[PDB]
Amino acid sequence: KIEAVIFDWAGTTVDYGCFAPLEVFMEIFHKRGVAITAEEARKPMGLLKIDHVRALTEMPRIASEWNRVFRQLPTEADIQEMYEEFEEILFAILPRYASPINAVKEVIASLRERGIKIGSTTGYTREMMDIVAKEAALQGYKPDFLVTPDDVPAGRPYPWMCYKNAMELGVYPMNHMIKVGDTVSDMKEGRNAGMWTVGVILGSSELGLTEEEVENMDSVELREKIEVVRNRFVENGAHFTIETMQELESVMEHIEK
Amino acid sequence: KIEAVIFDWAGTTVDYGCFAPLEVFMEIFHKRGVAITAEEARKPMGLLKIDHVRALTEMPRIASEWNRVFRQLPTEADIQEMYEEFEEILFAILPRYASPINAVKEVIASLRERGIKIGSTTGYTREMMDIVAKEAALQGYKPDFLVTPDDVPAGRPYPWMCYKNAMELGVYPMNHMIKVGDTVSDMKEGRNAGMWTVGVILGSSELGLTEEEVENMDSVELREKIEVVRNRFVENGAHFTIETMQELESVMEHIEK
Ligand SMILES: [Mg+2]
Ligand SMILES: [Mg+2]
Domain coverage including residue A80: 20-97
Residues of B in contact with A170 (CB under 8 A): 153, 158
Q: Do B131 and B159 belong to one domain?
A: yes
* CATH number of domain containing B39: 1.10.150.240
Q: Do B116 and B79 belong to one domain?
A: no
Q: How many domains does chain B have?
A: 2
Run of H or E including A199: strand A196-200
Q: Do B79 and B188 belong to one domain?
A: no
Q: What DSSP designation does A25 have?
A: H
Helices B126-138, B76-91: crossing angle, 10 deg rounding: 20
Q: Do B125 and B183 belong to one domain?
A: yes
Q: B6 near B159, Cβ under 8 Å? A: no
Run of H or E including A177: strand A177-181
- Environment class of residue A69 by beta-carbon count within 10 Å: exposed (0-12), middle (13-18) or buried (19+)? exposed
> Of B93, B100, B75, B73, which Cα lies nearest the Cα of B12?
B100
Q: A177 near A2, Cβ under 8 Å? A: yes
From chain A, which residues contact B within 8 Å (Cβ)?
152-154, 158-160, 163-164, 166-168, 170, 172-175, 191-194
Q: Do A90 and A157 belong to one domain?
A: no
CA of A10 to the centre of ligand 1 (A): 4
- Domain boundary residue, one of A97, A120, A143: A97
Q: d(Cα B225, Cα B223) in Å, to the nearest integer? A: 6
Give whole-number Cα distances, A241 to A1, A114, A180, A194, A246, in Å.
20, 22, 9, 17, 12
Q: Do A186 and A115 belong to one domain?
A: yes
Compute CA A97 distance to the chain's CA centroid, rounded to the nearest angstrom.
12
Q: Do B141 and B252 belong to one domain?
A: yes
- Domain boundary residue, one of B97, B132, B154: B97
Residues of A labelled as active-site residues: 8, 49
Residues of B in contact with A153 (CB under 8 A): 167-168, 170
Q: Do A134 and A241 belong to one domain?
A: yes
Q: d(Cα B121, Cα B117) in Å, to the nearest integer? A: 14
Q: B69 near B34, Cβ under 8 Å? A: yes
Which ligand is the nearest neighbour of the Cα of A9?
1
> Of A176, A171, A216, which Cα lies nearest the Cα of A196?
A176
Resolution, given in Å to one decimal, reads: 2.8
B168/A166 Cβ within 8 A: no
- Could you confirm whether B105 is annotated as catalytic? no
* CATH number of domain containing A127: 3.40.50.1000
- Domain boundary residue, one of B41, B66, B97: B97
The terminus-to-terminus CA distance of chain A in angstroms comes to 9
Cα–Cα–Cα angle for A147, A85, A151, nearest 5°? 15
> Of B153, B179, B194, which Cα lies nearest the Cα of A165?
B153
Residue B113 neighbours by CB distance under 10 Å: 8
> Of B253, B213, B252, B248, which Cα lies nearest the Cα of B104?
B248
- Could you confirm whether B8 is annotated as catalytic? yes
Q: Do B226 and B144 belong to one domain?
A: yes
Q: Do A240 and A190 belong to one domain?
A: yes
Q: Do A44 and A140 belong to one domain?
A: no
Q: Do A159 and A134 belong to one domain?
A: yes
